[PDB]
CSV table of C-alpha atoms and ligand atoms in Angstrom, one decimal:
chain,number,residue,atom,x,y,z
A,5,UNK,CA,0.1,0.2,-0.1
A,6,UNK,CA,1.0,3.7,-0.8
A,7,UNK,CA,4.2,2.7,-2.6
A,8,UNK,CA,4.9,6.3,-4.2
A,9,UNK,CA,4.2,8.2,-1.2
A,10,UNK,CA,6.4,5.7,0.8
A,11,UNK,CA,9.2,6.2,-1.8
A,12,UNK,CA,9.1,10.2,-1.9
A,13,UNK,CA,9.3,10.0,2.1
A,14,UNK,CA,12.4,7.9,1.9
A,15,UNK,CA,14.2,9.8,-0.9
B,7,UNK,CA,7.6,40.6,20.2
B,8,UNK,CA,8.6,37.3,18.6
B,9,UNK,CA,10.9,34.9,20.7
B,10,UNK,CA,14.2,33.6,19.3
B,11,UNK,CA,12.9,29.8,19.6
B,12,UNK,CA,10.2,30.9,17.6
B,13,UNK,CA,11.9,33.2,15.1
B,14,UNK,CA,13.7,30.1,14.1
B,15,UNK,CA,10.8,27.9,13.5
B,16,UNK,CA,9.2,30.4,11.3
B,17,UNK,CA,12.6,30.9,9.5
B,18,UNK,CA,13.3,27.3,8.7
B,19,UNK,CA,9.5,26.7,7.5
B,20,UNK,CA,9.7,30.0,5.6
B,21,UNK,CA,12.9,28.6,4.1
B,22,UNK,CA,11.4,25.2,2.9
B,23,UNK,CA,8.3,26.9,1.5
B,24,UNK,CA,10.8,28.8,-0.7
B,25,UNK,CA,12.9,26.2,-1.5
B,26,UNK,CA,11.2,24.5,-4.6
B,27,UNK,CA,8.8,26.3,-7.2
B,28,UNK,CA,6.8,24.8,-10.0
B,29,UNK,CA,8.8,24.0,-13.1
B,30,UNK,CA,8.6,26.7,-15.9
B,31,UNK,CA,8.1,23.8,-18.3
B,32,UNK,CA,4.9,23.1,-16.5
B,33,UNK,CA,3.8,26.9,-15.9
B,34,UNK,CA,4.5,28.1,-19.4
B,35,UNK,CA,1.8,25.7,-20.8
B,36,UNK,CA,-0.9,27.9,-19.1
B,37,UNK,CA,0.0,30.4,-21.5
B,38,UNK,CA,1.3,28.3,-24.7
B,39,UNK,CA,-0.9,25.4,-25.1
B,40,UNK,CA,-4.4,25.4,-26.9
B,41,UNK,CA,-7.1,26.0,-24.7
B,42,UNK,CA,-9.1,22.9,-25.0
B,43,UNK,CA,-11.3,20.9,-22.2
B,44,UNK,CA,-9.0,18.3,-22.7
B,45,UNK,CA,-5.8,20.2,-22.8
B,46,UNK,CA,-7.3,22.1,-19.9
B,47,UNK,CA,-7.5,19.1,-17.6
B,48,UNK,CA,-4.2,17.5,-18.9
B,49,UNK,CA,-2.1,20.7,-17.7
B,50,UNK,CA,-4.1,21.0,-14.2
B,51,UNK,CA,-3.6,17.2,-13.7
B,52,UNK,CA,0.2,17.7,-14.5
B,53,UNK,CA,0.5,20.6,-12.2
B,54,UNK,CA,-1.4,19.0,-9.2
B,55,UNK,CA,0.8,15.7,-9.6
B,56,UNK,CA,3.9,18.1,-9.6
B,57,UNK,CA,2.8,19.9,-6.3
B,58,UNK,CA,2.2,16.5,-4.8
B,59,UNK,CA,5.8,16.2,-4.9
B,60,UNK,CA,6.6,19.5,-3.7
B,61,UNK,CA,4.0,18.8,-0.8
B,62,UNK,CA,6.0,16.0,0.6
B,63,UNK,CA,9.4,17.5,0.2
B,64,UNK,CA,7.8,20.4,2.1
B,65,UNK,CA,6.2,18.4,4.7
B,66,UNK,CA,8.6,16.1,5.3
B,67,UNK,CA,10.8,19.2,6.5
B,68,UNK,CA,8.1,20.3,8.8
B,69,UNK,CA,9.5,20.0,12.2
B,70,UNK,CA,8.8,16.6,14.0
B,71,UNK,CA,7.1,15.4,11.2
B,72,UNK,CA,9.6,12.5,10.3
B,73,UNK,CA,9.1,11.2,14.0
B,74,UNK,CA,5.3,10.4,13.8
B,75,UNK,CA,4.0,6.9,13.1
B,76,UNK,CA,4.6,6.3,9.3
B,77,UNK,CA,1.0,5.5,8.7
B,78,UNK,CA,-0.1,8.8,10.1
B,79,UNK,CA,2.2,10.5,7.8
B,80,UNK,CA,0.4,9.0,5.1
B,81,UNK,CA,-2.9,9.9,6.5
B,82,UNK,CA,-1.9,13.7,6.9
B,83,UNK,CA,-0.4,13.9,3.3
B,84,UNK,CA,-3.4,12.2,2.0
B,85,UNK,CA,-5.7,14.2,4.1
B,86,UNK,CA,-4.2,17.9,3.1
B,87,UNK,CA,-3.4,17.5,-0.3
B,88,UNK,CA,-6.5,19.1,-1.7
B,89,UNK,CA,-6.4,21.7,0.9
B,90,UNK,CA,-2.9,22.5,0.3
B,91,UNK,CA,-3.5,22.7,-3.2
B,92,UNK,CA,-6.4,25.4,-2.6
B,93,UNK,CA,-4.0,27.5,-0.6
B,94,UNK,CA,-1.1,27.3,-3.3
B,95,UNK,CA,-3.6,28.3,-6.1
B,96,UNK,CA,-5.3,31.1,-4.2
B,97,UNK,CA,-1.9,32.4,-3.4
B,98,UNK,CA,-1.2,32.2,-7.3
B,99,UNK,CA,-4.5,34.2,-8.1
B,100,UNK,CA,-4.4,36.4,-5.0
B,101,UNK,CA,-0.6,37.3,-5.6
B,102,UNK,CA,-1.1,37.6,-9.6
B,103,UNK,CA,2.3,35.7,-9.6
B,104,UNK,CA,3.6,35.9,-13.2
B,105,UNK,CA,4.4,32.4,-13.5
B,106,UNK,CA,1.0,31.8,-12.8
B,107,UNK,CA,-0.8,33.5,-15.6
B,108,UNK,CA,-4.0,33.9,-13.3
B,109,UNK,CA,-6.3,34.9,-16.2
B,110,UNK,CA,-5.3,32.2,-18.4
B,111,UNK,CA,-5.0,29.3,-15.3
B,112,UNK,CA,-8.4,30.5,-14.4
B,113,UNK,CA,-9.4,29.9,-18.0
B,114,UNK,CA,-8.3,26.4,-17.8
B,115,UNK,CA,-10.2,25.6,-14.5
B,116,UNK,CA,-13.3,27.2,-15.7
B,117,UNK,CA,-13.4,24.7,-18.6
B,118,UNK,CA,-11.9,21.3,-17.4
B,119,UNK,CA,-14.9,19.4,-16.9
B,120,UNK,CA,-15.5,20.6,-13.3
B,121,UNK,CA,-19.3,21.2,-12.1
B,122,UNK,CA,-20.6,24.6,-11.7
B,123,UNK,CA,-21.6,23.6,-8.3
B,124,UNK,CA,-17.8,23.4,-7.7
B,125,UNK,CA,-16.3,26.3,-9.6
B,126,UNK,CA,-18.7,28.9,-7.9
B,127,UNK,CA,-17.6,28.0,-4.3
B,128,UNK,CA,-13.8,27.6,-5.5
B,129,UNK,CA,-13.4,31.5,-7.1
B,130,UNK,CA,-15.8,32.7,-4.2
B,131,UNK,CA,-13.0,31.2,-1.9
B,132,UNK,CA,-10.3,32.5,-4.2
B,133,UNK,CA,-11.8,36.1,-3.9
B,134,UNK,CA,-12.4,36.4,-0.2
B,135,UNK,CA,-9.2,35.0,1.0
B,136,UNK,CA,-7.6,37.5,-1.7
B,137,UNK,CA,-9.1,40.2,0.2
B,138,UNK,CA,-7.0,39.1,3.5
B,139,UNK,CA,-3.9,40.5,1.8
B,140,UNK,CA,-2.0,37.6,3.3
B,141,UNK,CA,1.8,37.6,3.6
B,142,UNK,CA,3.9,34.7,2.2
B,143,UNK,CA,4.3,34.0,5.9
B,144,UNK,CA,0.4,33.6,6.5
B,145,UNK,CA,0.1,31.4,3.4
B,146,UNK,CA,3.1,29.2,4.4
B,147,UNK,CA,2.1,28.7,8.2
B,148,UNK,CA,-1.6,28.2,6.9
B,149,UNK,CA,-0.2,25.4,4.8
B,150,UNK,CA,2.1,23.8,7.5
B,151,UNK,CA,-0.9,24.0,9.8
B,152,UNK,CA,-3.3,22.3,7.4
B,153,UNK,CA,-0.8,19.8,7.1
B,154,UNK,CA,-0.4,19.0,10.4
B,155,UNK,CA,-4.2,18.6,11.2
B,156,UNK,CA,-4.5,16.3,14.1
B,157,UNK,CA,-8.2,15.8,13.3
B,158,UNK,CA,-7.8,13.9,9.9
B,159,UNK,CA,-9.7,10.6,9.3
B,160,UNK,CA,-7.4,7.4,10.2
B,161,UNK,CA,-5.1,9.0,12.5
B,162,UNK,CA,-3.9,6.9,14.9
B,163,UNK,CA,-2.0,9.3,17.5
B,164,UNK,CA,-3.7,12.3,16.9
B,165,UNK,CA,-2.0,14.0,20.1
B,166,UNK,CA,1.2,13.8,18.5
B,167,UNK,CA,-0.1,15.7,15.7
B,168,UNK,CA,-1.4,18.6,18.0
B,169,UNK,CA,2.0,18.8,19.9
B,170,UNK,CA,3.4,19.6,15.9
B,171,UNK,CA,0.7,22.0,15.2
B,172,UNK,CA,0.3,24.1,18.3
B,173,UNK,CA,3.6,25.7,18.0
B,174,UNK,CA,2.9,26.8,14.4
B,175,UNK,CA,-0.6,28.2,15.1
B,176,UNK,CA,1.1,30.4,18.1
B,177,UNK,CA,3.7,31.7,15.6
B,178,UNK,CA,0.7,32.8,13.2
B,179,UNK,CA,-1.2,34.5,16.0
B,180,UNK,CA,2.0,36.3,17.6
B,181,UNK,CA,2.3,37.7,14.0
B,182,UNK,CA,-1.3,38.8,13.7
B,183,UNK,CA,-0.6,40.9,17.1
B,184,UNK,CA,2.2,42.4,15.5
B,185,UNK,CA,1.5,43.3,12.1
B,186,UNK,CA,-2.3,43.8,12.5
B,187,UNK,CA,-2.4,45.6,16.3
B,188,UNK,CA,-5.3,47.3,14.9
B,189,UNK,CA,-7.3,44.2,13.7
B,190,UNK,CA,-7.4,41.8,16.3
B,191,UNK,CA,-10.0,39.5,14.6
B,192,UNK,CA,-7.3,38.7,11.9
B,193,UNK,CA,-5.9,35.7,13.3
B,194,UNK,CA,-9.4,34.3,13.7
B,195,UNK,CA,-10.0,35.4,10.2
B,196,UNK,CA,-7.1,33.2,9.1
B,197,UNK,CA,-8.2,30.2,11.0
B,198,UNK,CA,-11.5,30.2,9.3
B,199,UNK,CA,-10.0,29.4,6.2
B,200,UNK,CA,-9.0,26.1,7.5
B,201,UNK,CA,-12.9,25.1,8.1
B,202,UNK,CA,-13.7,26.6,4.5
B,203,UNK,CA,-11.1,24.4,3.1
B,204,UNK,CA,-12.3,21.5,4.9
B,205,UNK,CA,-15.4,22.1,2.9
B,206,UNK,CA,-14.2,21.6,-0.5
B,207,UNK,CA,-12.7,17.8,0.3
B,208,UNK,CA,-16.2,16.6,-0.4
B,209,UNK,CA,-16.8,18.4,-3.7
B,210,UNK,CA,-13.6,17.3,-4.9
B,211,UNK,CA,-14.0,13.3,-4.1
B,212,UNK,CA,-17.2,14.2,-6.1
B,213,UNK,CA,-15.1,15.4,-8.9
B,214,UNK,CA,-12.8,12.6,-8.9
B,215,UNK,CA,-15.7,10.2,-9.5
B,216,UNK,CA,-17.0,12.3,-12.2
B,217,UNK,CA,-13.9,12.8,-14.2
B,218,UNK,CA,-13.2,8.8,-13.5
B,219,UNK,CA,-16.5,7.2,-14.9
B,220,UNK,CA,-15.5,9.8,-18.2
B,221,UNK,CA,-12.5,7.9,-18.3
B,222,UNK,CA,-10.4,10.9,-17.3
B,223,UNK,CA,-6.6,10.3,-16.8
B,224,UNK,CA,-5.2,10.9,-13.8
B,225,UNK,CA,-1.4,9.8,-12.6
B,226,UNK,CA,-0.2,6.9,-10.2
B,227,UNK,CA,0.5,9.7,-7.8
B,228,UNK,CA,-2.6,11.4,-7.6
B,229,UNK,CA,-4.7,8.0,-7.9
B,230,UNK,CA,-2.7,6.9,-4.6
B,231,UNK,CA,-3.1,10.3,-2.8
B,232,UNK,CA,-6.7,10.4,-3.4
B,233,UNK,CA,-7.7,6.7,-3.3
B,234,UNK,CA,-8.7,6.0,-6.8
B,235,UNK,CA,-9.1,2.5,-8.0
C,301,LIG,C1,-5.8,16.8,-11.4
C,301,LIG,C2,-6.4,18.4,-11.8
C,301,LIG,C3,-7.6,18.1,-13.1
C,301,LIG,C4,-7.4,19.0,-10.4
C,301,LIG,O1,-8.4,18.7,-10.0
C,301,LIG,N1,-8.8,19.5,-9.1
C,301,LIG,C5,-7.8,20.6,-9.0
C,301,LIG,C6,-7.9,21.3,-8.0
C,301,LIG,C7,-7.7,21.2,-6.5
C,301,LIG,CL1,-6.8,19.5,-6.1
C,301,LIG,C8,-7.6,22.3,-5.7
C,301,LIG,C9,-8.3,23.5,-6.0
C,301,LIG,C10,-8.5,23.7,-7.6
C,301,LIG,C11,-8.6,22.8,-8.5
C,301,LIG,CL2,-8.8,23.3,-10.1
C,301,LIG,C12,-6.6,20.1,-9.7
C,301,LIG,C13,-5.5,20.9,-10.2
C,301,LIG,O2,-4.8,21.2,-8.9
C,301,LIG,C14,-4.0,22.1,-8.8
C,301,LIG,C15,-3.7,23.3,-9.9
C,301,LIG,C16,-2.9,24.2,-9.9
C,301,LIG,C17,-1.9,24.3,-8.6
C,301,LIG,C18,-0.8,25.3,-8.8
C,301,LIG,C19,-0.2,26.0,-9.9
C,301,LIG,C20,1.0,26.7,-9.6
C,301,LIG,C21,1.2,27.9,-10.6
C,301,LIG,C22,2.6,28.7,-10.7
C,301,LIG,C23,3.1,28.4,-9.6
C,301,LIG,C24,3.0,27.1,-8.8
C,301,LIG,C25,4.2,27.0,-7.7
C,301,LIG,O3,3.7,26.0,-6.9
C,301,LIG,O4,5.3,27.7,-7.6
C,301,LIG,C26,2.1,26.6,-8.8
C,301,LIG,C27,-1.8,23.5,-8.0
C,301,LIG,CL3,-0.5,23.5,-6.7
C,301,LIG,C28,-2.8,22.3,-8.0
């Protein structure tokens, strides 16, 4: 769930 | 008088707010492209996807955000995206920002498949808030405050959010006492926008479903943030 938001938050 | 421990918060936040802007590649289209219901919708989509990006970057830099439950961070991002977007657009129209091409931008929004029931309230909001003569700092604090709203749906630790928001509200109030000593109701006037903003979430979800059945194209980023199959 929420791949893209999670990814932007770790970048 | 603003404190030192507070003047640093406002500075850090004012700093992040001005860090990134929207790409000229995107904003030039408001002017250059054809004015079609299709092209209009696509430009509006492109700007929103892009802004979702700046929103995460900005929010992440918000003091104490990266400390909250990670499932709460998604709920805050998912719950404020539309409101943060109304504030940014209102700022654009309000400050007649050059890279905003207000008149043409309004054209594109006026013809993108948005129901009149929604456009009216949208622009009325744009008007009334413009008439507040908000300073970049009020926009930036209302945004951060909107982002850190403890009362969003699906929040686990709503108390941890309030702890992050109260400091920002106070800095905003401290400013309204300084730069608006004549008008004491100014602070309460700024907070009223947080309620008006709330009102648009119901309208927006309607629009999302309307556009969806009409096979309108969104983006993986927007579909995720706005729960759209
Ligand atoms: C997906 C699309 C069809 C869409 O469906 N509903 C809205 C919608 C929302 Cl969610 C809320 C209020 C009204 C509207 Cl029509 C939308 C566009 O969403 C936007 C539109 C424009 C902007 C800002 C542009 C700008 C210009 C110059 C500069 C900058 C800048 O950030 O520097 C930013 C932003 Cl942020 C978000």
